[PDB]
Structure formats: C-alpha cells, structure tokens
Amino acid sequence: GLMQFTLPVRLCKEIELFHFDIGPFENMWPGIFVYMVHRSCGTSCFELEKLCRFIMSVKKNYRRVPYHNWKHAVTVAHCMYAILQNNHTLFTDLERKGLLIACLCHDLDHRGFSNSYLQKFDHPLAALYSTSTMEQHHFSQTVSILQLEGHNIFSTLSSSEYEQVLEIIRKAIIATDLALYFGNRKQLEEMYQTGSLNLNNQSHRDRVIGLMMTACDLCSVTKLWPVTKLTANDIYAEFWAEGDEMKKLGIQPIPMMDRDKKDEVPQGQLGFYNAVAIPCYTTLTQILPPTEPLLKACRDNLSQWEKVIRGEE
C-alpha cells in the first residue's frame, strides 16, 4: 500500500508529455503502466498483487506481430494517461480506472489482419460477430482474463460500479473500430458547432470517450518524426502481410496493402493524415483544449511526410 513505482528521472518527466516513447525495454512497460495507474487513479484503485497478475496475463495474450502487439497496448494506454492528466477534473474515478484498462486490453489477441480480411477469409469470428469483428473479440478476451481466479482487479467495486466500468470498457474497445470513428467524429463536430455538446448527457460522454480512444489508438502519428517514421514500417509490415493473404484468396488487395506499390506509401500517409488523423485531433482539441499538443505533433508529422514526397528525404 505504501509501495509506489518510481521511474528514472528522464522517464519520470518525459512520461507526462503526449509524445513520450516507452522505449525498447519490454521489461519496463508493466512498471510504466502501473506507474500511470497509481498517478491517474491512486495507489488504492487496484490491489497490486491482482493488477500485476492481470497485466502479465494481458501481456501473454498479445501476439508477436509487427505492430498490433504488447508495445501498441502500452503506448495507447500512455496516451490515454496523458489525456487524463491534462483534463484532471472532467472524468469520474470509474472512468480513469476503466479507460486505462480499456486501452491496455483494446487489441488483445490481434493477429495483424483487418475486420475485412476476416470477412473475405470466412474466419469463424466473422460468423460470431458481423460488425466490429476483432473489437468484439478483444472485449471478449478482456472479460475472459477478468474471470481468471486471482485476476478480478475490480472485485472491490459494487455490483453497480462493476457494471458501469465493464460498460465503459466495452464501448471504449468497440469505439477503436475505425469504421465507426468517422460518424462518431461527424456527430461530435455538429454537437460542438450547434453548441448542444453536454458532458452530463451520458451518450455525449460515450461519443467523447470514443474519440479519445481513436486519438490514443492512432497516437503513433503524434510522436517525434523518427518514432512516427519507424512505427510506420511496423504498421505497413502487417498491411503487406494482409495484402499477400488477399492475393492468396485470389483478390487484388487495396494498394495500401500491396507490397508491390511501396512507392505510393508517402501519398497514402498524406490521405490518412488528411482523412483521419488531423480531423480526429482537431475535433478532440475543440472538445478538450489541453490535448492540443497531439494536433501540433500530428501536423508536424504531416509536414514531414510532405517532405518525403518532395524528395527532401
């Protein structure tokens, strides 16, 4: 109970910034995560014996894929921590508790293929969940790990607080389905502009938490140029793997996913920053002003991809 985690000085300071990289030392990520829980939430939130067992079972159920891995899990949780620490008073104790666990669990058992590839493959999970296929799986695995003897980090809540938190986590995890991001953002757009956004409306909060989740999930585009650029290879290595498996099914994959069209990547990144990242971080900044640094970083990186195209690297 009197046992804080402490980080070396440089991490202690840099972890509070949106653009923190968690580093190449696997073995420090669990301590990073706990550290963030203890400062976001309190040393009380979770029994340390149980948090640690939960964290290690979650680590175990992420696979060795290029991008959709344990590192992504912890990275996305850090971004949610940065958002929660720059917006101290806007979120309930339950919401701080739920959302950090949501982000750690959000990609549980990912194999590195899109919802689409599951549907064209006719994978069993596409029979069992027609929309938001991997995300309903991810929520499912989170509940499974929550139910292992020794792993219920929520056991100290009330029947009703318990049901609220699992409902926060489920919406949080389903919202990472980028197909759903577009309308979620258009609606928050209308609601902020007409002036009807109201954070005491639960369904308004849901939408806002959903956009924070998209923001954290994409946060690799909000890093310093060299982190953003080296992560983009991981993200593309999965895309190209999927393009190959598309070709194996006798389907020409989209160019994004075709490893024969690497040349078109820098223009592809442009589309994505323009169609997805910049709008996500704009609306989020409007709703939560202190998250502006994610917009500024995203813009710097768009600029860096423009240079890649203009032959200046």
Ligand X SMILES: Nc1cnc2cc(Cl)ccc2n1
Residues 214 to 233 in contact with Zn ion, rule: CB under 5 A: 217
Find the shortest distance in angstroms from Cβ 111 to Mg ion.
Answer: 11
Q: Helix, strand or coil for residue 157?
A: coil
| Binding-site member from 107, 234, 238, 242 for Mg ion (CB under 5 A) | 107
Q: Distance between CA atoms of 259 and 264, rounded to whole angstroms?
A: 10
The 160-179 contact track toward Mg ion, x by CB under 5 A, reads: ----------------x---
Residue 107 assigned ligand-binding role: yes
Q: Distance between CA atoms of 303 and 277, rounded to whole angstroms?
A: 13
Report if residue 177 touches Zn ion, rule: CB under 5 A: no
3-state SS of 207-266 is: HHHHHHHHHHHCHHHHCCHHHHHHHHHHHHHHHHHHHHHHHHCCCCCCHHHCHHHHHHHH
The 237-266 contact track toward ligand X, x by CB under 6 A, reads: -------------------x----------
> Which single residue is written with the structure tokens 């003897």?
149
| Binding-site member from 15, 55, 211, 232 for ligand X (CB under 6 A) | 232
Which amino acid is present at 159? S
Are 163 and 154 within 8 A, CB to CB?
A: no
Backbone angles phi, psi at 113, to 5 degrees: -120, 150
Listed residue (218, 72, 52, 229) closest to 138, CA to CA: 72
Find the shortest distance in angstroms from Cβ 107 to Zn ion.
Answer: 4
Nearer to Zn ion, 95 or 217 (CB): 217
Q: Distance between CA atoms of 313 and 306, rounded to whole angstroms?
A: 10
Q: Distance between CA atoms of 307 and 305, rounded to whole angstroms?
A: 5
| Binding-site member from 35, 62, 139, 272 for ligand X (CB under 6 A) | 272
Listed residue (5, 101, 115) closest to 58, CA to CA: 101
Stretch that binds Zn ion, among 31-39, 202-210, 212-220, 246-254 (CB under 5 A): 212-220
Catalytic residue among 19, 68, 110, 137: 68
Nearer to ligand X, 113 or 272 (CB): 272
Report if residue 221 touches ligand X, rule: CB under 6 A: yes
Q: Distance between CA atoms of 173 and 132, rounded to whole angstroms?
A: 10
The 180-209 contact track toward ligand X, x by CB under 6 A, reads: ------------------------------
Report if residue 268 touches ligand X, rule: CB under 6 A: yes
Report if residue 107 touches Zn ion, rule: CB under 5 A: yes
Residue 217 assigned ligand-binding role: yes
Residue 88 assigned ligand-binding role: no
Residue 110 assigned ligand-binding role: no
Report if residue 242 touches Mg ion, rule: CB under 5 A: no
* Lookup: tokens for 18: 């949106």
Q: Is 110 a catalytic residue?
A: no
Find the shortest distance in angstroms from Cβ 262 to Mg ion.
Answer: 24
Radius of gyration of the chain (CA): 19
* Lookup: tokens for 179: 């197909």
Half-sphere exposure of 122 (CA within 13 A, CB side): 1
| Chain positions contacting Zn ion, by CB under 5 A | 107, 217
* Binding-site entries: 68, 72, 106-107, 217, 269
* Binding-site entries for 3',5'-cyclic AMP: 68, 269
Q: Which residues are catalytic?
A: 68
| Chain positions contacting Mg ion, by CB under 5 A | 107, 176
| Chain positions contacting ligand X, by CB under 6 A | 218, 220-221, 232, 235, 256, 268-269, 272
